[PDB]
Amino acid sequence: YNIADSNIANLGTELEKKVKLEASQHEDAWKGAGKQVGVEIWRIQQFKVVPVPKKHHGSFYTGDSYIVLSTYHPKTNPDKLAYDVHFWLGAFTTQDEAGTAAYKTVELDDYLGGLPVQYREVQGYESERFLSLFPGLRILDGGVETGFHHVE
Amino acid sequence: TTALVCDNGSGLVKAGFAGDDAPRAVFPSIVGRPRHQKDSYVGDEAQSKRGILTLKYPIEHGIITNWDDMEKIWHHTFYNELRVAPEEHPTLLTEGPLNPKANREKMTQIMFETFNVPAMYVAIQAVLSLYASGRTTGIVLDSGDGVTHNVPIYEGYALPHAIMRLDLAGRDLTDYLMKILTERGYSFVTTAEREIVRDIKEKLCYVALDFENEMATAASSSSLEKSYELPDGQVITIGNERFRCPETLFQPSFIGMESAGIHETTYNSIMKCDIDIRKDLYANNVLSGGTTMYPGIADRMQKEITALAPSTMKIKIIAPPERKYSVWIGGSILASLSTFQQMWISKQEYDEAGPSIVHRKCF
Ligand SMILES: Nc1ncnc2c1ncn2[C@@H]1O[C@H](COP(=O)(O)OP(=O)(O)NP(=O)(O)O)[C@@H](O)[C@H]1O
Ligand SMILES: [Ca+2]
Ligand SMILES: [Ca+2]
Ligand SMILES: [Mg+2]
């Protein structure tokens, strides 16, 4: 099986990138994101990307999933911005929340031109990079309800 | 406004509503007609009349080969199972990678022109499974009834040059079990008898961690044998067939194929990817589909991939318990997101552009 006349012949193209960049323009949460050095945090709430108030950054509900955008100046230019995007998956988050966090992490990457480097951060397995964002982490019991309807 | 999610497997339709945690309709992708040569029956009702019907699958190896019967399956899914009017529901369909472009062109044409859906999208099955696992990077082994695919994905983008495909999956394993059971003295030949063998396979087969040792164990005593009650009440005994059947996934020569086994196709797919991302793929091998349900398969994949990979490489096989439905669940999640729905083909766009639009919108 080869690629040329197949349903993957348009993968990896500029067209794919253009379509996904346009889709990312339709998420209000990204408007104004990544405009200055710092950490921005959203939580998945019934499939929606919901900002976390600044005063609660660094506290994470174990039942929930989050997107954490770290904007910083790269070594190559002190006046430009680069990005690490971490998605944090609580030990008790549900499948809809983790899957939405993953998809929306890609979307935020798209919105920022592909520049963010993605990091999957499962509770208990957080990278040194993620730990360093909170010089600490506070884990809270509970979380918001799943967006899934349960099929009996 | 609720979107429909339909994962048209070669063997099973999984269908339901976006936002649900599981498909509400799961039934065989079959059309049955009288074995002696309404006029036809679909899905569970064809299964209900298996005694008098010959069963035909309109999808072979992930590709629709009987469009008239496929339309019957879709009509049945909408009107008889889900009991919805399809013109009222945006519809997400699925497809395996490396299919010929005409397959999704005709899928799009029939959805709009026959079923009058308001909008639709065709998604790559393995990508849906990766998102269902909560990942943007990993390599999916998606093995159903028709195709086994290796799909490496990095930061949400499948790497098309490294995607690999093998037309060996559950249907071939069922056929092989029918053959080797016939060689034990239990004749299974008809399309009806095949479905009994498929049940034996799902209930009793497993992947041995060391195949040669397991053959020796089976020949030395009956400690691995299992009894199985037939519909007529007769009790048969199966032995080494329990693990010889799925061993074919690792040794395709069992069915006369010279292809690499699933451990080797996985390794070969990782090796087609840039060196520095292989580490993330090795640690995130995600199993998807019914043919990855055999007990022992994750442990065997871990062993076999460890033997092929660098000695310093962290290897991990992820086996979601729900993986018979991972594709569908990933679709339910993505179809619940407004930005993903923004990418779907509308009826007005189809009316303007025709089937070619599917390649410009669905990635
Ligand atoms: N527990 C099990 N052990 C082994 N095989 C199983 C088990 N459960 C289901 N299967 C097989 O898995 C296949 C159906 O899996 P499924 O993932 O629904 O395939 P599909 O999506 O219909 N086909 P495809 O077009 O290749 O993706 C059949 O061959 C089943 O016999
Ligand atoms: Ca939650
Ligand atoms: Ca990126
Ligand atoms: Mg499938």
Separation between Cα atoms, residue B62 and residue B64, nearest integer Å? 7
Which atom belonging to ligand 1 lies closest to the Cα atom of B7? 21
Judge contact between B46 and B55, C-beta under 8 A.
yes
Strand ranges inside B52-156, DSSP E = 53-56, 59-60, 63-64, 91-95, 119-124, 138-143, 148-154
> Closest partner residue to B336 among A9, A98, A147, by Cβ?
A147
- Residue A97 assigned as binding residue: yes
Judge contact between B121 and B138, C-beta under 8 A.
no
Judge contact between B82 and B74, C-beta under 8 A.
no
Separation between Cα atoms, residue B104 and residue B122, nearest integer Å? 7
- Collapsing DSSP to helix, strand or coil, B135 comes out as coil
Judge contact between B293 and B325, C-beta under 8 A.
no
**Bridge-partner residues for B292, per DSSP?**
none
Experimental method: X-ray
Give the dihedral of Cα atoms A138, A140, A146, A147; nearest 10 deg: -50
Partner-chain contact B98 A7, CB within 8 Å: yes
Separation between Cα atoms, residue B140 and residue B162, nearest integer Å? 12
Domain ranges of chain A: 14-140
**Bridge-partner residues for A68, per DSSP?**
A41, A86
Residues 6+ apart with CB under 8 A from B280: B137, B138, B154
Question: How is the beta sheet containing A117-122 ordered, strand by strand?
Answer: A48-51, A38-45, A65-72, A82-89, A117-122
Query: What single-letter amino acid sits at B151?
Result: V
Question: Which resolution in angstroms does this entry have?
Answer: 1.4
**Bridge-partner residues for A23, per DSSP?**
none
CB atoms within 10 A of CB B204: 18
Does any CB of chain B come closer than 8 Å to the CB of residue A58? no
**What does each C-alpha distance from B254 to B169, B180, B243, B249 come to in angstroms?**
13, 11, 12, 9
Output the six-digit token pair for A120: 């999957």
Partner-chain contact B134 A101, CB within 8 Å: yes
Output the six-digit token pair for A96: 């809809």
Judged on CB neighbours under 10 Å (0-12, 13-18, 19+), B306 is: middle
Partner-chain contact B163 A120, CB within 8 Å: no
Chain B positions in Cβ-Cβ contact with residue A150 (cut-off 8 Å): 20-21
Question: How is the beta sheet containing B345-346 ordered, strand by strand?
Answer: B25-28, B12-17, B4-8, B91-95, B119-124, B345-346
Output the six-digit token pair for B160: 């098309």
Judge contact between B123 and B93, C-beta under 8 A.
yes
**Bridge-partner residues for B14, per DSSP?**
B7, B26
- Residue A144 assigned as binding residue: yes
Judge contact between B339 and A27, C-beta under 8 A.
yes
Mutate to test the interface with A, among B20, B137, B153, B337 (most CBs of A within 10 A): B337
Mutate to test the interface with A, among B61, B128, B137, B155 (most CBs of A within 10 A): B155
Q: Which CATH number fits domain A14-140: 3.30.70.20, 3.10.105.10, 3.30.390.50, 3.40.20.10?
A: 3.40.20.10
Per-residue buried b or exposed e for B270-300, using 16+ beta carbons within 10 Å of the residue's own CB = beebeeebbebbbbbbbbbbbbbbbeebbeb
Judged on CB neighbours under 10 Å (0-12, 13-18, 19+), B231 is: exposed
Q: What is the DSSP string of A75-95?
A: TT-TTS-EEEEEEEE-TT--H
Chain B positions in Cβ-Cβ contact with residue A102 (cut-off 8 Å): 130-131, 134-136, 156
Q: Can you give the three-state secondary structure of B333-356, one letter per residue?
A: HHCCCHHHHCCCEEHHHHHHHCCC
Backbone angles phi, psi at A84, to 5 degrees: -110, 130
Separation between Cα atoms, residue B351 and residue B141, nearest integer Å? 37
Q: What domains does chain B contain, in order, with CATH numbers? A: 4-37+39-124+325-361 (3.30.420.40), 134-168+260-318 (3.30.420.40), 170-253 (3.90.640.10)
Q: What is the DSSP string of B84-107?
A: --GGGS-EEEEE-TT-BHHHHHHH
CB atoms within 10 A of CB B23: 26
Separation between Cα atoms, residue B317 and residue B286, nearest integer Å? 6
Strand ranges inside A46-125, DSSP E = 48-51, 59-61, 65-72, 82-89, 117-122
Local structure of residue A54 (DSSP, 8 states): G
Dihedral (CA of B262, B95, B91, B82) sign? negative
Output the six-digit token pair for B265: 């196709």
CA B82 to chain centre: 21
Residues 6+ apart with CB under 8 A from B212: none
- Taking alpha carbons only, the member of B165, B192, B161, B153 closest to residue B56 is B192
